[PDB]
Amino acid sequence: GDPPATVYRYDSRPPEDVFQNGFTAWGNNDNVLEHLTGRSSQVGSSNSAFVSTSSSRRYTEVYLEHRMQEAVEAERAGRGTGHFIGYIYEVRADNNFYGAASSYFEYVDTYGDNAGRILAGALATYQSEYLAHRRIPPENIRRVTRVYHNGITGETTTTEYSNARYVSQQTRANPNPYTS
Numbered sequence: 001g002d003p004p005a006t007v008y009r010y011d012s013r014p015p016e017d018v019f020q021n022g023f024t025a026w027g028n029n030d031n032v033l034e035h036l037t038g039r040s041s042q043v044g045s046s047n048s049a050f051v052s053t054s055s056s057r058r059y060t061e062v063y064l065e066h067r068m069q070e071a072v073e074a075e076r077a078g079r080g081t082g083h084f085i086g087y088i089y090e091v092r093a094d095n096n097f098y099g100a101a102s103s104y105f106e107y108v109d110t111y112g113d114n115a116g117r118i119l120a121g122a123l124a125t126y127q128s129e130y131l132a133h134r135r136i137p138p139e140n141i142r143r144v145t146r147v148y149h150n151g152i153t154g155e156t157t158t159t160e161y162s163n164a165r166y167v168s169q170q171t172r173a174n175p176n177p178y179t180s
């Protein structure tokens with residue numbers, strides 16, 4: 001019943017960056033609906049105040065696999081090399097991580113939605129999702145799984161290593177919804 005002590009994040013950026021610097025959110029837009037619909041992320045206004053994570057490692061693997069498959073399709077069509085490297089970061093959650101579901105229900109029951117119209121064509125999703133407000137320090141980042149895909153040979157290689165900067169502290173995600 002406790003909030004998760006560990007969450008996961010798929011990101012394209014390599015540990016030389018992330019292990020040293022942590023994750024910082026795009027900007028100061030802490031509207032939960034705009035984030036969960038994807039409107040404030042990289043593909044939208046790139047100003048979200050949240051860093052998305054999941055209590056489900058499988059969720060982040062599916063996400064990684066989708067991006068890898070896009071590279072595979074690009075090579076098959078002559079519009080890419082097929083090369084892809086994706087990373088799944090294992091992260092210790094603390095009180096600055098908020099459950100997406102509870103944050104979403106509170107938000108939309110108060111200010112409402114506009115389904116399909118917040119981002120265009122997007123519904124708000126949130127199942128195993130946890131939102132870190134503004135930043136995840138490098139000290140929270142435990143390890144990474146590196147998935148390397150050779151675009152021409154098709155071989156996929158997976159390796160794992162820990163972050164020297166990780167600090168073992170006793171924390172878990174916030175039990176409460178995010179409120180602005």
Ligand SMILES: Nc1ncnc2c1ncn2[C@@H]1O[C@H](COP(=O)(O)OP(=O)(O)OC[C@H]2O[C@H](O)[C@H](O)[C@@H]2O)[C@@H](O)[C@H]1O
Nearest residue numbers: 010011012013024025026035036037038041042043051052
């Ligand atoms: N601060 C940054 N600086 C440079 N690149 C960044 C930065 N943040 C992200 N990227 C790059 O931007 C890429 C995407 O990271 P993100 O914008 O956080 O979005 P998501 O993928 O977590 O999903 C966010 C929400 O959207 C959907 O609704 C989801 O379900 C979530 O609810 C990173 O891999 C990096 O290449």
Ligand SMILES: NC(=O)c1cccnc1
Nearest residue numbers: 009010052053054060129
């Ligand atoms: N970037 C991610 O791993 C992620 C986790 C949960 C929801 N959306 C994105």
